[PDB]
Nucleic acid binder design. Sequence first.
RNA 1: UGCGCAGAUACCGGGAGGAACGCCGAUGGCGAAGGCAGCCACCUGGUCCACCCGUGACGCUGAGGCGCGAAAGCGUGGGGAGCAAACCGGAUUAGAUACCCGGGUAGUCCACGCCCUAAACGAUGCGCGCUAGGUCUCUGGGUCUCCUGGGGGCCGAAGCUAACGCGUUAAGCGCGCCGCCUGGGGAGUACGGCCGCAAGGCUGAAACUCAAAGGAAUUGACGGGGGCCCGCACAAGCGGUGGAGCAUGUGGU
Lengths: 70, 155, 119
Amino acid sequence: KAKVKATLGEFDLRDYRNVEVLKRFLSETGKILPRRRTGLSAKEQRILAKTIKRARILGLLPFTEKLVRK
Amino acid sequence: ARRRRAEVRQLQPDLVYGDVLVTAFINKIMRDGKKNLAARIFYDACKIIQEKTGQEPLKVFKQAVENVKPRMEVRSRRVGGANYQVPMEVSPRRQQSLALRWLVQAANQRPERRAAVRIAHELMDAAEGKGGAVKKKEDVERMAEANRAYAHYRW
Amino acid sequence: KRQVASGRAYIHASYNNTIVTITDPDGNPITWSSGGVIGYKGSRKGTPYAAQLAALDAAKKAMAYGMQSVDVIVRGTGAGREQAIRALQASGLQVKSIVDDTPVPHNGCRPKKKFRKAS
RNA sequence: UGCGCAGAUACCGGGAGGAACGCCGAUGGCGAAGGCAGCCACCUGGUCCACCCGUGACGCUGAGGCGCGAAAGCGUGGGGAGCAAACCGGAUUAGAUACCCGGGUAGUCCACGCCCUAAACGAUGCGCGCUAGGUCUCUGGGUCUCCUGGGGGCCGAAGCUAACGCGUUAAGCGCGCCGCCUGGGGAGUACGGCCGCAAGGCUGAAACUCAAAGGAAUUGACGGGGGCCCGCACAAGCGGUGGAGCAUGUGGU
Ligand SMILES: [Mg+2]
Ligand SMILES: [Mg+2]
Ligand SMILES: [Mg+2]
Ligand SMILES: [Mg+2]
């Protein structure tokens, strides 16, 4: 399938507000997706984990969700 | 039987009704290798299902057998801590044998003083569905089912 | 005693006992069952059969209140698990949705020495 | 054992409190070591690169000294959710002062002050110069197929090594400085000195005794190690011995 960067166009991944983008880097359990799936570089992947965690504290992205249909 | 899965030793058909399943039965009745007396007995027994019922012996035989085949049974299983009677289905060859084994045994347990009668009654009483064979059939089926809890190993 | 039309079945699986409880759409318990609550007692309450039985039995008690449909919520791993789900599904009592929801700390209290054999 | 009809378990709401931060997470990164993991801010250390601008050998090592030094431990004062030496019980066992289960104090956490040890491990002191490559990777820079640094891994030229291995992250070839060894047991014990509130730490022998103690590899044998095979080995069967009387052989008397 796709890497989550292969999807988007250009974006500021220091931007802890843009939930419309940042929301795509989470699993269905709202867990930060691994590099192998994000398609990101070690360095970007570092920066993102940060931005994602900042969003979570503002209330805009989730810490967790629950698996639907198991 | 490590190497091959063994050919099911085939049987000559019966020289009367022409059925493998009959000789099979005859063989079980046989004692010290005396097949003659063995055969006389089973036929003379089919005669006591004329004299007694309007039906054809073969049909009674078939239909009694079909009545003493188990569907389930507990095969034993060791695991490091206890012993587990695990219910699995019964492959049709085993059914065949248990039934025919059981009949003869059930039959030789009966009271009447003569080979061909014991065979006969049993055969009748079990095609009705009330054999002492059929006891040690519903027991096995029951013994599984009571151990239905452990029926999730079945290897 | 009210008629509820639909609500929640909560399955709590463990390696020692499966337990199932049924509630109204705000999570208030209507009825419930467990391995022990059927006959099994000691190490049999875990077996997927025990799970199935309990599960089915709880559903029957809820169907008394006329319960027709449920959202399932499953929690924990253990033998009875898919079997208690398979049960509710096949109890008539209609299965709207399923959802695992097992608790997990984001690294919380020190686990008992049995559970850090992964030391 | 325990807990539960003084209503537990499972479920929904609310609150209180302590400890640790899931996914990201790596074969990753930083640090001299010990060690460092949610997120934000402030205060602060080390390090790498590019430009080739400044000083002009200002360097290397480093006995002693000082400082840091996981865990456990100690003192005073807090705190205490989960876990847990000791301990109190349930089991298991020939016994079971254990492994398994239920509880549980010190302790684990915070403040300040002590202790100063470790498989404190890369079991490899620090620095510099020299000696093929290939491959993966972190972080820079350029003219960005790749090139040039700095770090992290594997493979391996030459060479080295008892071997196994090491092999531009040397265990190679060489210079400088430090620290350490000199058969095993007695023994990191004794005495002595120093340090510590203690526990104890550092330094550290002899008599006596042994012809060994060791390292790496080899062929076997073995494993309540792994993989794959076979045999009336087990399973599936059929008939038996074990019980009786007698025959025969043996034990013993
Ligand atoms: Mg401590
Ligand atoms: Mg203290
Ligand atoms: Mg304990
Ligand atoms: Mg010592």
